[PDB]
């Protein structure tokens, strides 16, 4: 497991415990749930590239205290 | 509100994905980049004088949405006791004192489609048309049918 900070444009920093070999699906949906918006309404970046539902921290080389940047989608989903 | 723009976008796509759209009963087009104005289209419901017709609806989202309703008007002229024959202004509760903040674009479009199939002549928007509906149903139908051909592609 690994702490990961999710940062929005307001500059809010919300902390998550995440398993190393588990789909980032969960993180992304849990964040959207926390914020009361539909998933597919937000996109999530790590090192300027979008996470995907199939991606895990196993791959991507994701570390402790690493940051993920979240943005609103044009469509808004 | 960006809450209001994100919302409208979501409800726009909800109509896009709807069964009623895939059946071509309702549709919505985007007018402004900002989602403050839409254009709706409803089919003339079957077994009414509008049948065969398509009716465009100007939809404008005021700044106090969703606490006030969308401002809806017929662009397509139509002969109906609850719609102005001159302006397309609409008499319909959900656009007035029965608006509810959780109502969606889809809900509105379906209500208007049901409006076409179900008049309330004792609460008219067009008292001439409503008086005719009540006093001379047959002239009302022939006229509604000719307006539907002339103005609504029937």
From Swiss-Prot, chain A:
Domain of life: Eukaryota
Site description Interaction with PIAS2, residues in chain: 16
Modification sites for Phosphoserine: 12
Keyword Glycoprotein: no
Residue location of crosslink Glycyl lysine isopeptide (Gly-Lys) (interchain with K-? in acceptor proteins): 77
Effect of residue 77 to A: Abolishes sumoylation of ZBED1
Keywords of this entry: Acetylation, Cell membrane, Chromosomal rearrangement, Cytoplasm, Host-virus interaction, Isopeptide bond, Membrane, Nucleus, Phosphoprotein, Ubl conjugation, Ubl conjugation pathway
GO molecular function, one term: transporter activator activity
Cellular compartment(s): Nucleus membrane; Nucleus speckle; Cytoplasm; Nucleus, PML body
Region described as (Microbial infection) Interaction with Tula hantavirus: spans on this chain: 17-20
A biological process from GO: negative regulation of transcription by transcription factor localization
Modification after translation, per record: Cleavage of precursor form by SENP1 or SENP2 is necessary for function. Polymeric SUMO1 chains undergo polyubiquitination by RNF4.
Cross-link (Glycyl lysine isopeptide (Lys-Gly) (interchain with G-Cter in SUMO1)): 5
Chief subcellular location: nucleus
Covalent link location (Glycyl lysine isopeptide (Lys-Gly) (interchain with G-Cter in SUMO2)): 3, 17, 19, 25-26
Domain Ubiquitin-like: 1-77
Gene Ontology cellular component list: cytosol; glutamatergic synapse; nuclear body; nuclear membrane; nuclear pore; nuclear speck; nuclear stress granule; nucleolus
Keyword flag Phosphoprotein: yes
Free-text function comment from the UniProt entry: Ubiquitin-like protein that can be covalently attached to proteins as a monomer or a lysine-linked polymer. Covalent attachment via an isopeptide bond to its substrates requires prior activation by the E1 complex SAE1-SAE2 and linkage to the E2 enzyme UBE2I, and can be promoted by E3 ligases such as PIAS1-4, RANBP2 or CBX4. This post-translational modification on lysine residues of proteins plays a crucial role in a number of cellular processes such as nuclear transport, DNA replication and repair, mitosis and signal transduction.
UniProt disease link: Non-syndromic orofacial cleft 10: A birth defect consisting of cleft lips with or without cleft palate. Cleft lips are associated with cleft palate in two-third of cases. A cleft lip can occur on one or both sides and range in severity from a simple notch in the upper lip to a complete opening in the lip extending into the floor of the nostril and involving the upper gum.
Assembly with partners or alone: Covalently attached to KCNB1; UBE2I increases cross-linking with KCNB1 and PIAS1 decreases cross-links with KCNB1. Interacts with SAE2, RANBP2, PIAS1 and PIAS2. Interacts with PRKN. Covalently attached to a number of proteins such as IKFZ1, PML, RANGAP1, HIPK2, SP100, p53, p73-alpha, MDM2, JUN, DNMT3B and TDG. Also interacts with HIF1A, HIPK2, HIPK3, CHD3, EXOSC9, RAD51 and RAD52. Interacts with USP25 (via ts SIM domain); the interaction weakly sumoylates USP25. Interacts with SIMC1, CASP8AP2, RNF111 and SOBP (via SIM domains). Interacts with BHLHE40/DEC1. Interacts with RWDD3. (Microbial infection) Interacts with Epstein-barr virus BGLF4.
Similarity remark: Belongs to the ubiquitin family. SUMO subfamily.
Protein name in the entry: Small ubiquitin-related modifier 1
Gene: SUMO1
From Swiss-Prot, chain B:
Cross-link (Glycyl lysine isopeptide (Lys-Gly) (interchain with G-Cter in SUMO1)): 13
Residue ranges of domain UBC core in the record: 3-153
Pathway the protein takes part in: Protein modification; protein ubiquitination
Cross-link (Glycyl lysine isopeptide (Lys-Gly) (interchain with G-Cter in SUMO)): 13
EC number: 2.3.2.23
UniProt subcellular location: Cytoplasm
Catalytic residues, chain numbering: 91 (glycyl thioester intermediate)
Keywords assigned: Acetylation, ATP-binding, Cytoplasm, Isopeptide bond, Nucleotide-binding, Phosphoprotein, Transferase, Ubl conjugation, Ubl conjugation pathway
Keyword DNA repair: no
Any GO BP: protein polyubiquitination
The organism's place on the tree of life at top rank: Eukaryota
Main location: cytoplasm
PTM sites of type N-acetylalanine: 1
Chain positions with N6-acetyllysine modification: 13
Subunit field text: Interacts with RNF138/NARF. Interacts with BRCA1.
Function: Accepts ubiquitin from the E1 complex and catalyzes its covalent attachment to other proteins. In vitro, in the presence or in the absence of BRCA1-BARD1 E3 ubiquitin-protein ligase complex, catalyzes the synthesis of 'Lys-48'-linked polyubiquitin chains. Does not transfer ubiquitin directly to but elongates monoubiquitinated substrate protein. Mediates the selective degradation of short-lived and abnormal proteins, such as the endoplasmic reticulum-associated degradation (ERAD) of misfolded lumenal proteins. Ubiquitinates huntingtin.
Protein name: Ubiquitin-conjugating enzyme E2 K
Record organism: Bos taurus
Lineage: Eukaryota, Metazoa, Chordata, Craniata, Vertebrata
Name of encoding gene: UBE2K
């Amino acid at each position: 497991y690994i702490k990961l900070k999710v940062i929005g444009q307001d500059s809010s920093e919300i902390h998550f415990k995440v398993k190393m070999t588990t789909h980032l699906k969960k993180l992304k949906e849990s964040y959207c749930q926390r914020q009361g918006v539909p998933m597919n309404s937000l996109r999530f970046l790590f090192e300027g590239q979008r996470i995907a539902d199939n991606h895990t921290p196993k791959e991507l080389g994701m570390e402790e205290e690493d940051v993920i940047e979240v943005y609103q989608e044009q469509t808004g989903g | 509100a960006n809450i209001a723009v994100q919302r409208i976008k979501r409800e726009f796509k909800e109509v896009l994905k709807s069964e009623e759209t895939s059946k071509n009963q309702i549709k919505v087009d985007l007018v402004d980049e900002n989602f403050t104005e839409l254009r709706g289209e409803i089919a003339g419901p079957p077994d009414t004088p509008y049948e065969g017709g398509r009716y465009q609806l100007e939809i404008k989202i005021p700044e106090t949405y969703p606490f006030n309703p969308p401002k809806v008007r017929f662009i397509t002229k139509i002969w109906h006791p609850n719609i102005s024959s001159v302006t397309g202004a609409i008499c319909l509760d959900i656009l007035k004192d029965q608006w509810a903040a959780a109502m969606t674009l889809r809900t509105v479009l379906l209500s208007l489609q049901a409006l076409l199939a179900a008049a309330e002549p004792d609460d008219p928007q067009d008292a001439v048309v409503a008086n005719q509906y009540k006093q001379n149903p047959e002239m009302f139908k022939q006229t509604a049918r000719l307006w539907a051909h002339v103005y609504a592609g029937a």
